[PDB]
Amino acid sequence: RDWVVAPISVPENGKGPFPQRLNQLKSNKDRDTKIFYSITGPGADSPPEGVFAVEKETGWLLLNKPLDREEIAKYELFGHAVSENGASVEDPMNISIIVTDQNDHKPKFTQDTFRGSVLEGVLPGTSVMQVTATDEDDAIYTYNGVVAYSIHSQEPKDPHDLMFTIHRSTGTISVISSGLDREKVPEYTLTIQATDMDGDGSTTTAVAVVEILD
Ligand SMILES: [Ca+2]
Ligand SMILES: [Ca+2]
Ligand SMILES: [Ca+2]
Ligand SMILES: [Ca+2]
């Protein structure tokens, strides 16, 4: 029919070119007279003003610039159709616009520094602590916001290096070697990493400080 518009999905960070046609509004009343189209709503005539617009004569709905999903993920605008003699010829039309995700956010550890402690005599397999990173991108239908964890490096490297691991998805740091000795090394500092696209994407760091208890 005319004067209907299906919900519209727009991936954020479009390259365009801009302005960009999305949909065309039309009233059947335009055989019988000249019609002027307009658009109102948050994103059109109210903040953020002028992201969307509509061509007066043609009814083309237009996007004027790239969208950001994490700023605004959905718009509801309203289309109007007014004849040349000034009478509206349609009831204002609901235009729904959905902003879909691209992976444009690095993960963030919730703290710059995490602390955990174990007794000197714990067995290999012992959970020390659980660190967490978040990611603002979609983690439901994509891996854009799915974080894989890894250990970047360990200091010091006595009695040897790679004495801990991290659970790839939970962030649980565990001890995988024997040989802890508070007297020799009372404390380890682990730089830890969080990578989105489940390990294929971009990566941030944090520190996890492990104390060997007395
Ligand atoms: Ca964004
Ligand atoms: Ca991400
Ligand atoms: Ca995103
Ligand atoms: Ca990568």
Curated annotation (Swiss-Prot):
Residues 2-109, 110-214 form the Cadherin domain. It comes from the Eukaryota. It is found in: Cell membrane. Glycans are attached at residue 94. Expressed in some normal epithelial tissues and in some carcinoma cell lines. Three calcium ions are usually bound at the interface of each cadherin domain and rigidify the connections, imparting a strong curvature to the full-length ectodomain. Interacts with CDCP1 and CTNNB1. Cadherins are calcium-dependent cell adhesion proteins. They preferentially interact with themselves in a homophilic manner in connecting cells; cadherins may thus contribute to the sorting of heterogeneous cell types. It is linked to Hypotrichosis congenital with juvenile macular dystrophy: A disorder characterized by congenital hypotrichosis, early hair loss, and severe degenerative changes of the retinal macula that culminate in blindness during the second to third decade of life. This is Cadherin-3. It comes from Homo sapiens.
